[PDB]
Design a protein around this ligand. Structure first.
Ligand SMILES: Cc1cccc(NC(=O)c2ccc(C)c(Nc3nc(-c4cccnc4)nc4c3cnn4C)c2)c1
Length: 266
């Protein structure tokens, strides 16, 4: 793993909180803006294992749609994980702040990216477990990168008996699809966590977003199959989203939106 000397790192502002440290924005000389996760004095043995273990696996990943590791500071204290900085931040907040500002093709393109990075993770035998728009970062080319800094996002088997697999990630990716196409709406709106699980078990599923291609709704619906073996694999998801994008007239057929309010005018 690329070891970085602390003299090359300039922390500037705090932007979040880690396991046992803060997360900063800063500069890296070799000047490149970076995000910095620190492990502060007093960390436990387990925290160090997880911290440097996160660094190790990130260093193994090399994919367009996975956040890139710039390097690590492990020979000096505080220890640091240093990644590329993504100017547009977390996808959930991004979309909520840019409601209606993109084309359907752009939105589906985001989803293709996320799916490509998840296919890569799943093939590397990495189970994310917390896939959600809030863990996806967006750069100045609209490229979405899976990161890892959730009842409503979690497959039934992962909730019920903690079976977390790439197939439970697929369920979550279904929910991310809906997040994207709704521009960051809260999945299941104000339903409580227990009402969500009850709804799912009862067989209900999130309704179609407004202005949503029929193909895209069909795909998220198949990510939400109760039977884990029936869900698409990420290879299936990437393949469909790539074909839809490359034949973009396919996205013009829209699923019917179920109106929650009727407005009558002559
Ligand atoms: C695939 C995988 C597997 C396993 C683990 C991971 N780990 C990371 O993805 C990770 C690890 C370290 C860092 C420095 C980053 N960077 C960022 N984290 C945050 C942030 C974090 C926490 C609270 N608020 C914001 N914000 C950022 C970046 C970059 N730009 N921005 C705006 C990400 C990834």
């Amino acid at each position: 793993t690329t070891e970085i000397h602390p003299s090359c790192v300039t922390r500037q502002k705090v932007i979040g909180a880690g396991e046992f440290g803060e997360v900063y924005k800063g500069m890296l000389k070799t000047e490149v803006p970076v995000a910095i996760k620190t492990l502060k004095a007093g960390y436990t043995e387990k925290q160090r294992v997880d911290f440097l273990g996160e660094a190790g696996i990130m260093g193994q990943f090399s994919h367009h749609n996975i956040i890139r590791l710039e390097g690590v500071i492990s020979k000096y204290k505080p220890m640091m994980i240093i990644t590329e900085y993504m100017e547009n931040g977390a996808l959930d907040k991004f979309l909520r702040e840019k409601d209606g500002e993109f084309s359907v093709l752009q939105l589906v393109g985001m989803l293709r990216g996320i799916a490509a990075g998840m296919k890569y993770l799943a093939n590397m035998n990495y189970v994310h477990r917390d896939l959600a728009a809030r863990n996806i970062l967006v750069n100045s080319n609209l490229v979405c990168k899976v990161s890892d800094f959730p009842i409503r996002w979690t497959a039934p088997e992962a909730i019920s008996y903690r079976k977390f697999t790439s197939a439970s990630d697929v369920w979550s990716f279904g929910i991310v699809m809906w997040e994207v196409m709704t521009y960051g709406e809260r999945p299941y709106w104000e339903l409580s966590n227990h009402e969500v699980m009850k709804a799912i078990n009862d067989g209900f599923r999130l309704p179609t977003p407004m202005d949503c291609p029929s193909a895209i709704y069909q795909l998220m619906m198949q990510c939400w199959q109760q039977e884990r073996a029936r869900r698409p694999k990420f290879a299936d998801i990437v393949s469909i989203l790539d074909k839809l994008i490359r034949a973009p007239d396919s996205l013009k057929t829209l699923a019917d939106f179920d109106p929650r309010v009727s407005i009558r005018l002559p």
